[PDB]
Structures are given as structure tokens and as C-alpha cells.
Design an enzyme around this catalytic site. Structure first.
Site, PDB file in Angstrom:
ATOM      1  N   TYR A   7      -7.854   8.445  11.659  1.00 55.81           N
ATOM      2  CA  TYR A   7      -7.278   8.890  12.924  1.00 55.81           C
ATOM      3  C   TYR A   7      -7.996  10.068  13.596  1.00 55.81           C
ATOM      4  O   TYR A   7      -7.499  10.639  14.572  1.00 55.81           O
ATOM      5  CB  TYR A   7      -5.799   9.218  12.710  1.00 55.81           C
ATOM      6  N   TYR A  21       0.790  -1.219   0.000  1.00 55.44           N
ATOM      7  CA  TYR A  21       0.000   0.000   0.000  1.00 55.44           C
ATOM      8  C   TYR A  21       0.825   1.273   0.000  1.00 55.44           C
ATOM      9  O   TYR A  21       1.999   1.276   0.360  1.00 55.44           O
ATOM     10  CB  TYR A  21      -0.917   0.040   1.240  1.00 55.44           C
ATOM     11  N   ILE A  67      -7.058   0.746  10.963  1.00 58.42           N
ATOM     12  CA  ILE A  67      -8.146   1.717  11.017  1.00 58.42           C
ATOM     13  C   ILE A  67      -9.423   1.146  10.409  1.00 58.42           C
ATOM     14  O   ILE A  67      -9.376   0.306   9.502  1.00 58.42           O
ATOM     15  CB  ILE A  67      -7.783   3.038  10.304  1.00 58.42           C
ATOM     16  N   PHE A 102      -5.598   5.813   0.091  1.00 57.17           N
ATOM     17  CA  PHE A 102      -4.710   4.660   0.028  1.00 57.17           C
ATOM     18  C   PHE A 102      -4.891   3.940  -1.292  1.00 57.17           C
ATOM     19  O   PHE A 102      -5.999   3.886  -1.840  1.00 57.17           O
ATOM     20  CB  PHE A 102      -4.994   3.630   1.128  1.00 57.17           C
ATOM     21  N   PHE A 150       2.456   9.661   3.324  1.00 58.44           N
ATOM     22  CA  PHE A 150       2.760   9.564   4.749  1.00 58.44           C
ATOM     23  C   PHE A 150       3.209   8.180   5.178  1.00 58.44           C
ATOM     24  O   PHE A 150       3.660   8.002   6.307  1.00 58.44           O
ATOM     25  CB  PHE A 150       1.558  10.002   5.611  1.00 58.44           C
ATOM     26  N   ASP A 151       3.083   7.198   4.288  1.00 55.97           N
ATOM     27  CA  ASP A 151       3.477   5.837   4.615  1.00 55.97           C
ATOM     28  C   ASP A 151       3.211   4.901   3.446  1.00 55.97           C
ATOM     29  O   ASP A 151       2.305   5.136   2.644  1.00 55.97           O
ATOM     30  CB  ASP A 151       2.701   5.351   5.846  1.00 55.97           C
TER      31      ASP A 151
END
Length: 125
Positions: A95, A33, A63, A117, A43-44
Site C-alpha cells: 500500500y 490468509y 496488491i 502474510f 490487520f486482516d
């Protein structure tokens, strides 16, 4: 990618429909991902970690947007093995106003962030 927006705000588009079975509640699965904010900032990503994420789906290990976004929910069909799906997640299912990756009040994921995502559901682990 024209999003299909479900009753909860969680939206998706199946860029590539899987060729295998649908994801199953409680199964240990693997997924690559890339997560980005709405400004394009990554961010990731599993790629940055050098490995896919291995986790069980549908039991709150991630999440809510991932559980519902991969396993399905009202207005959201399940991803199928080998599929690639883009997910737009409202803060309520991510979040919240808390944010994530925080150092004091400055967070990698700002409070009330809608998350995007690109998910590659490889299949079961």
C-alpha cells in the site's frame, strides 16, 4: 522461516510445499490468509472474515506482492496447490506511503508498511 529475498525485496519462505500444480495466471483461486504488521499486529485474515478469499491471480485484483508472491516473479517461484507460504512485502508492492484502512491520517496499515502474510493456497475456485 529463513526468507529468500528476490531482486525486488519481495521475500518468501515455503513453510509447506504444495502437492498440486503451480498457480496459473488469470485463474480464479481460493486462499486463506493472515496478514500482520512487523510488530505482530494482525490487520486482516480470511479467518476473521469467516471465508477464504476468492479472487483471480495475476491480474491486479490484489496488491502486487500477492500477484508476484503467489504466481511468482524473478527470484520467486510460484506457489503450488495446497502450499503454505509466508510472504514479506515491501511497501512498494503493497500500500505504499498511502497506507490502508485509513480514517484521516490514521491507518490500520500505516504508511510505508512492510506486510507479512501467511498464505494458504487452497487451489482453484
Amino acid at each position: 522461516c529463513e526468507f529468500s529475498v528476490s531482486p525486488s525485496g519481495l521475500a518468501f519462505c515455503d513453510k509447506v510445499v504444495g502437492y498440486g500444480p503451480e498457480a496459473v495466471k488469470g485463474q480464479l483461486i481460493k486462499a486463506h490468509y493472515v496478514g500482520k504488521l512487523e510488530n505482530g499486529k494482525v490487520f486482516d485474515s480470511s479467518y476473521n472474515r469467516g471465508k477464504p478469499l476468492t479472487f483471480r491471480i495475476g491480474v491486479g485484483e490484489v496488491i502486487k506482492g500477492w500477484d508476484q508472491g503467489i504466481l511468482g516473479s524473478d527470484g520467486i517461484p510460484p506457489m503450488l496447490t495446497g502450499g503454505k507460504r509466508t510472504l514479506r512485502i515491501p511497501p512498494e508492492l503493497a500500500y505504499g506511503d498511502r497506507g490502508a484502512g485509513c480514517k484521516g491520517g490514521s491507518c490500520l496499515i500505516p504508511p510505508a508498511s512492510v506486510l507479512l502474510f501467511d498464505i494458504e493456497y487452497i487451489g482453484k475456485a
